Design an enzyme around this catalytic site. Structure first.
Site, PDB file in Angstrom:
ATOM      1  N   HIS A  84       1.058  -1.195  -0.090  1.00 30.21           N
ATOM      2  CA  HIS A  84      -0.052   0.150  -0.030  1.00 30.21           C
ATOM      3  C   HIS A  84       0.845   1.107   0.118  1.00 30.21           C
ATOM      4  O   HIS A  84       1.743   1.530   1.057  1.00 30.21           O
ATOM      5  CB  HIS A  84      -0.773  -0.113   1.186  1.00 30.21           C
ATOM      6  CG  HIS A  84      -1.864   1.196   1.368  1.00 30.21           C
ATOM      7  ND1 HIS A  84      -2.666   1.525   0.618  1.00 30.21           N
ATOM      8  CD2 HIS A  84      -1.709   2.179   2.413  1.00 30.21           C
ATOM      9  CE1 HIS A  84      -3.230   2.460   0.983  1.00 30.21           C
ATOM     10  NE2 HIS A  84      -2.755   3.080   2.171  1.00 30.21           N
ATOM     11  N   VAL A 144       0.618   0.588  12.471  1.00 24.04           N
ATOM     12  CA  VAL A 144       1.024  -0.908  12.384  1.00 24.04           C
ATOM     13  C   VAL A 144       0.819  -1.329  13.792  1.00 24.04           C
ATOM     14  O   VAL A 144       0.190  -2.482  13.871  1.00 24.04           O
ATOM     15  CB  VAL A 144       2.690  -0.985  12.281  1.00 24.04           C
ATOM     16  CG1 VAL A 144       3.003  -2.374  12.496  1.00 24.04           C
ATOM     17  CG2 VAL A 144       3.326  -0.459  11.108  1.00 24.04           C
ATOM     18  N   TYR A 200      -7.863  -2.678   6.900  1.00 22.11           N
ATOM     19  CA  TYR A 200      -7.328  -1.393   7.283  1.00 22.11           C
ATOM     20  C   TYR A 200      -8.040  -0.479   6.905  1.00 22.11           C
ATOM     21  O   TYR A 200      -8.361   0.632   7.686  1.00 22.11           O
ATOM     22  CB  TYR A 200      -6.077  -1.487   6.563  1.00 22.11           C
ATOM     23  CG  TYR A 200      -5.256  -0.057   6.677  1.00 22.11           C
ATOM     24  CD1 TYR A 200      -4.921   0.388   7.702  1.00 22.11           C
ATOM     25  CD2 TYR A 200      -5.291   0.570   5.394  1.00 22.11           C
ATOM     26  CE1 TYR A 200      -4.041   1.874   7.505  1.00 22.11           C
ATOM     27  CE2 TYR A 200      -4.605   1.937   5.347  1.00 22.11           C
ATOM     28  CZ  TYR A 200      -3.858   2.595   6.404  1.00 22.11           C
ATOM     29  OH  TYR A 200      -3.490   3.874   6.401  1.00 22.11           O
ATOM     30  N   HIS A 216     -11.044   0.220   9.381  1.00 15.18           N
ATOM     31  CA  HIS A 216     -10.474   0.425  10.832  1.00 15.18           C
ATOM     32  C   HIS A 216     -10.612   1.893  11.276  1.00 15.18           C
ATOM     33  O   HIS A 216     -10.418   2.795  10.843  1.00 15.18           O
ATOM     34  CB  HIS A 216      -9.251  -0.144  10.881  1.00 15.18           C
ATOM     35  CG  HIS A 216      -8.744  -0.432  12.248  1.00 15.18           C
ATOM     36  ND1 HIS A 216      -8.672   0.622  13.501  1.00 15.18           N
ATOM     37  CD2 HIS A 216      -8.391  -1.345  13.083  1.00 15.18           C
ATOM     38  CE1 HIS A 216      -8.537  -0.028  14.650  1.00 15.18           C
ATOM     39  NE2 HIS A 216      -7.864  -1.181  14.380  1.00 15.18           N
TER      40      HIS A 216
HETATM   41 MG    MG Z   1      -0.304  -4.554  12.677  1.00 17.70          MG
END
Ligand code: MG
Ligand code: MG
Lengths: 103, 103
Positions: B4, B30, B71, B74
């Site tokens: 990404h 992360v 992601y 999220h």
């Molecule tokens: Mg992670």
């Protein structure tokens, strides 16, 4: 390692087969040019619609800034760039050294 | 691994220190987001003057396309994106799976 990145779109009319050969032709600069170590690429499969129209991404891996320097100064690169660039409507280049958030 | 990539420039007025904290804030996704495995970044040091004005490049490493999918879905990412994006004049995103020319 100085990461050399090129983002672009292929002009109207450029066939899937031409792009295949064009990409193989670019990757071949690893062989023709000593300073260019590795080469990876990919078509864009994003979902955010923030790609600005660019369709592909090419990543080359050099060891130092001077390496990318010479690569640009290589006659084989100068020749091939004409072939590839003539196939693009637009090109976006970035040169960076992968920096990490660590100790 | 679905790579990404985000390329961008920081709006006028954004300080070097804000960019430092902003980048550390991005890299922190992360930790906050399971699907986002690694994060690397860099300022552009190209020489071809083909960077289209973009100054930085952020690279995140997911395992699958669905991972980048989650992601984006999220809440921590949705929240932080507001902070970061508000600091940009423009953002260019690309999602690709590093394809190689091999057997
Ligand atoms: Mg992670
Ligand atoms: Mg080589």
């Amino acid at each position: 390692p100085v990461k050399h990145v090129l983002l672009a779109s292929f002009k109207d009319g450029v066939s899937p087969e031409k792009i295949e050969e064009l990409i193989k032709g670019y990757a071949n600069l690893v062989n023709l040019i000593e300073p260019m170590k590795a080469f990876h690429w990919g078509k864009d499969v994003s979902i955010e619609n923030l790609h600005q129209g660019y369709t592909h991404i090419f990543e080359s891996t050099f060891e130092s800034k001077e390496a990318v320097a010479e690569y640009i100064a290589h006659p084989a690169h100068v020749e091939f760039a004409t072939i590839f660039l003539g196939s693009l409507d637009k090109v976006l280049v970035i040169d960076y050294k992968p920096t990490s958030v660590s100790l």
